[PDB]
Amino acid sequence: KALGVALIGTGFMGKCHAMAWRNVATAFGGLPPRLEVLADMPADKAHSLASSFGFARGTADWREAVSDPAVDVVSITTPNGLHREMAEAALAAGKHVWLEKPMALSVEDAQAMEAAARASDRRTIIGYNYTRSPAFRAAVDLIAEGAIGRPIHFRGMYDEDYMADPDLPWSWRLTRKDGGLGALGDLGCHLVSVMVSLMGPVARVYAQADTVITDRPHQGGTARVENEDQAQALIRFASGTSGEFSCSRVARGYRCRLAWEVQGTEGTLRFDQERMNELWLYQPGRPEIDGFRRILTGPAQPGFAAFCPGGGHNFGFNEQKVVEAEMLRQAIAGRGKAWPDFTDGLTIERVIHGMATSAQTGQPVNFL
Amino acid sequence: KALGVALIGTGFMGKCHAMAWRNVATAFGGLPPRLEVLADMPADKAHSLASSFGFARGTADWREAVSDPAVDVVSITTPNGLHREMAEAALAAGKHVWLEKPMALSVEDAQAMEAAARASDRRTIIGYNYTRSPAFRAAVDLIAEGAIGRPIHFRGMYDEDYMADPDLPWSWRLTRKDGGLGALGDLGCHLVSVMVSLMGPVARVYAQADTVITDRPHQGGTARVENEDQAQALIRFASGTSGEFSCSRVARGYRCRLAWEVQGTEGTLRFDQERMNELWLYQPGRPEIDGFRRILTGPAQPGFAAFCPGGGHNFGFNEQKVVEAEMLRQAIAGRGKAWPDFTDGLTIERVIHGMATSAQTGQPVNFL
Amino acid sequence: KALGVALIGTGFMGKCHAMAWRNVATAFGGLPPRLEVLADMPADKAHSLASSFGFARGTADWREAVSDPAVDVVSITTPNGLHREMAEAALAAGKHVWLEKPMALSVEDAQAMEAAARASDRRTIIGYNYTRSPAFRAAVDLIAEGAIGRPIHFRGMYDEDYMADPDLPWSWRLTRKDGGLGALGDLGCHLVSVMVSLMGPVARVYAQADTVITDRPHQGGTARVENEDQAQALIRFASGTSGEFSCSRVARGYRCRLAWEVQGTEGTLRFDQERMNELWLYQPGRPEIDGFRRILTGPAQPGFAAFCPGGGHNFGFNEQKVVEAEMLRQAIAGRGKAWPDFTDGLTIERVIHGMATSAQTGQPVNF
Amino acid sequence: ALGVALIGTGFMGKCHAMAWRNVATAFGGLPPRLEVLADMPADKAHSLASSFGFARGTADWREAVSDPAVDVVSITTPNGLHREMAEAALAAGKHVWLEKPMALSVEDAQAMEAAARASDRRTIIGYNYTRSPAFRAAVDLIAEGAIGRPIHFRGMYDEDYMADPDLPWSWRLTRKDGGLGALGDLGCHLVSVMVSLMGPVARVYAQADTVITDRPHQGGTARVENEDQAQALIRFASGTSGEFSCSRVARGYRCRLAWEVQGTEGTLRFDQERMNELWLYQPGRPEIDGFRRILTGPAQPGFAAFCPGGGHNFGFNEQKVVEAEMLRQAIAGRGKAWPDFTDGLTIERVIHGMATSAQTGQPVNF
């Protein structure tokens, strides 16, 4: 039978989830999910967006969305603030959960959520857009197949400039409670999701951070920016391999520059999300023709064929979310494991909070 | 009330239209179109895809679908010259038409369609989806605004390699009777759609063409390839301005390389569809910083903000079709003109056929 | 004995020749050419630049440089209108000639020079330095080896913007009588040298052209620009293969964008001179890894190893000229034929002037 | 005219020779006199003296450095002879152009730095990546406030000349006789660029690895003692952060010295494999906002001496002609050359500090 969907939130990621749920069966076949309940505030906004998004109804009561008998799975995309409350309420109501990163603002809340998930017998997945591109998934498979030999180094970054303007006003997100981590939270967690998928688990971090714009306008006065604008870290993976890692929300000229490369004993892979349809692969070759290959995204890569049969017809950012919906759909059907669930996700939260601790204490942080 | 939709065909473009119709209101607001009837063959396939696409019913008879009283607009997406009969039948039934290229194989048939469209007083649009990218629409606006001065030269190409391998079998597409034009028909029409939107109408062409792989495998023997693998032409626009134009279905390594540039008296614009989120702009600057700008697609560009609030989250090929659906939707409502209708579309047919004729005769062809 | 060198001109290409002759033996071995006489105007400039360039003396009289007993080879880098006179004089005096393109202002003059060169039994080479990069030369070898299969299309361009500003003053270079061709002369000839080296001889052209800025400032008033700012042409090669060709001196944002592509039945090669150290090669590959390769210039490519042992240490524009000098030195010594000599070069002049005629008359031109 | 001595004729040796030959061609003044070339064996010194245009070849570098017709000495030999040759030149009253490194050990470099000040001669270290018109233009742009205040540096120097595990073991792979690995071959160059952009390094925390631990030797295997790759987090004297790496086993990279400076009002980005491009972002109106590709041309320092028209790509070897000119002008008292043995010592301290941090697992302060 068709999956009954509830959606909480309609912003950047809320509407992304909505577009995804709308076309998951168009792309992948099977039964179209039923868009049952959309929750958002104010109520008039929830009603108007429910209409245009195609949800059977809208409400300002998020608990209605998680408890409706016709709902099987809940997409949660509202402020990180109430993620634990909403996710745990949905699991308690017997609903599968698609939770936008982060799990919660602290490791402690994430730990409790992880335990609730294991008790509920429902499927969970954390929204990690950037692990779903055909280019990224192709890279993981190429590494798995030995295309670059043994990985010997990872270098990744995630630069954007959405906070570079110092006139941008203060908000609750720039506080430790209310907001949690800064660039590490909004960007770093995404890079960690990609990094651990490529290199395996993180064994140790040593990090440094900075707040470049330390105070911002707050209507007459100013208030202090409490979380980091940028951070960098050196990594040791559980394999013993090295890594470099960074993120920034003040890196002028960058808009979605999640970029990484894996250097191996027999090749190199390189990617930049601002050009998400290109994957660069070097493997040793005859001297006359030796050099990096530009692999342009097409049907040979995971997921792409469900969207288009011809290569070079660029896959979009939003289609990453359709792929993510499908993974959850199949996991609910018992036809495939979804990653990361709340257990896998908690590890990612531990890593990013470990980097924040390292930057503050000046000490390396180790993981089991 | 919401627009009632009929869809004919389910391949490359059929699925693309279906995804567009499903998310058009999600992206742009208003009422979601009602997916009423899907027509395809065989019947079991029409029924299977109606279910997964979310259409109320499938049918093996398209004539049924176009006359359904619950239908207001008909998407015609067969990868075929066989569009005249379906297009005119829809218009005759008082339905608006979203037609995939070409209008027909012959200019004569396209001309009949153009007249039926005017007589019908229903809206029409041809699926020239490469005119819908935020980057392309931004370029047109920059030109209109005087950002590069007066255009002095156009250079465009559309290379792909889907027929490059001589091993690839013969098919009816390679006949003049059933396939019509070659590269000019498959790819050239698209380049013309973009070119004339940038530079204005074509006054004259002088062209060359080649069939470089003259025979292909066919049922244990070979059959002759009757249309062109590639073609090039020098253009004069009605403006008096010069142009260069090419297309190829045998250009090894290229997958969707619709690439163009407009050189003006005060700057230059350059674009490549394989990187559809980048627009290159040169305008004179102080010597120390002078150079082309990489304009990364974001909410400053037409259409983008309906899909994502943050720049650099790559807009995709399929989202062009959502934009196209919205343009038609607004034209139906009487709140904008959709381009190109069958009148504008006919001109495109005349141009590609004029290029083909010029290549065959070795003489220039005039259009005005 | 070391080659005795005369140099006429000290501008863009004159100084490029001077730097090349100075280090040709440093790169390639053998005896360093002797820099004997530098000719330039005015005399004070010739003396000054001779000193800094390392030439034994400078003179204001090009005839002195050509006739000097210690001179064996003459580099001619002066205005196109004097090329025939200077080249013929050098040949008549028994000197080998390195002549900057073009040969002359007319096909008629180029023919006379071609005849004079054969009459003389001295070596000649025309200075088409874009045929000298390791990337270009590697591409020619890859095509010969079958790396892209059978070539089926050529597409080339040469955009620059040195004349894009309409306030840039008029000069005699912009008349047909004294300046000759416009963009076709300054840029087109370079693209032809590359194009024919890749694709073989041209059989036919059909061209269009424009002068975008028809009048320019001249000493408070205005004067007419008589030659083209841009031109485009469709090509048929002697092989039967198709081509696209263009040039422009008004293409805003481009500085040395000589760019070309050869598409073949088993691959594609693509190049852009603004990134002269990269050659793009597509060949079929398994679907998981299929794509163009970025071949970064290194010691695997012709000429590079004479300048650097390590790949990725970018080869420079000026080092193309060092390669060109060595080709001439080896030709003079009987150890290699240099291309293009005045005979090969005459064909290039015929092609560029045929394009100009085609654009003027609106008719194709056959060769 | 400057009397030139040249010691060594391999990669850098020829590069120096080509530079000395064209330095006056490009920049004017008097062509330096190519007096004595020293190398071994004797036949090679004479052969190359002839093709390089030096008045004579010799197998004894000591006689070349003490020659009265010599004013300046280019030293391009193996790292293990740099101290001896450099101090001998300075003691003979000759100016010195020295290829990196100053020496294998910081202790030796310090002694060299002492001798340099006491000799009153000019010294320059061959950090040629600081000589490109693009790099020099970047420094000037930062000085004009084009990107505001620098807030982060990220740099790398990847190459793959040791990536093939079948490449034989050599003395260069010994701590004793090769010194540092990737940090010495590549790291030093990245430091020269980094401090030129960001000022002095205050602190580093580093990691390193030997990826290929054993290599074929005579009958077989011998252990590799120095690092194939290293990374570090940087704190500059300014307080600004940095990321730093180098590798000799990064497959596909040939000369990927790449750096980026992010500031409060813009970003600059560069990659030596495309040394004629400098990427600059500054905020712009929404419709046209984005990075600019600045193609190297006569607006950039040094370029016009080589070509009057932009986009005619400046090459690696021309960086060395620029370096030669800077030394010449320093000798003539018309401009100070960087880095001298004093500035050079600081660079040795940083790279060795990074090596120490990686070995001990502790940050190192300067």
Residue numbers in the entry:
A (entry chain D), B (entry chain C): 6 to 373
C (entry chain A): 6 to 372
D (entry chain B): 7 to 372
Paper lines:
The enzyme, therefore, turned out to be scyllo-inositol dehydrogenase with L-glucose dehydrogenase activity (P. laeviglucosivorans scyllo-inositol dehydrogenase; Pl-scyllo-IDH). Pl-scyllo-IDH formed a homo-tetrameric structure in the asymmetric unit, and this structure was considered the biologically relevant form, since a similar unit has been observed for myo-IDH from B. subtilis and GFOR from Zymmomonas mobilis. The N-terminal domain adopted a Rossmann fold motif for the binding of NAD+, and the C-terminal domain bound substrate.
The apo-Pl-scyllo-IDH structure was refined at 1.75 Å, and the other complex structures ranged from 1.8–2.3 Å, depending on the substrate. Interestingly, in the apo structure, an acetate molecule originating from the crystallization solution was also found to be bound in the active site. This molecule formed hydrogen bonds with Y135, Y165, E195, and H318, which were the same residues used for substrate binding, other than the three catalytic residues, which suggests that these 4 residues may only be required for substrate binding, although the role of H318 remains unclear.
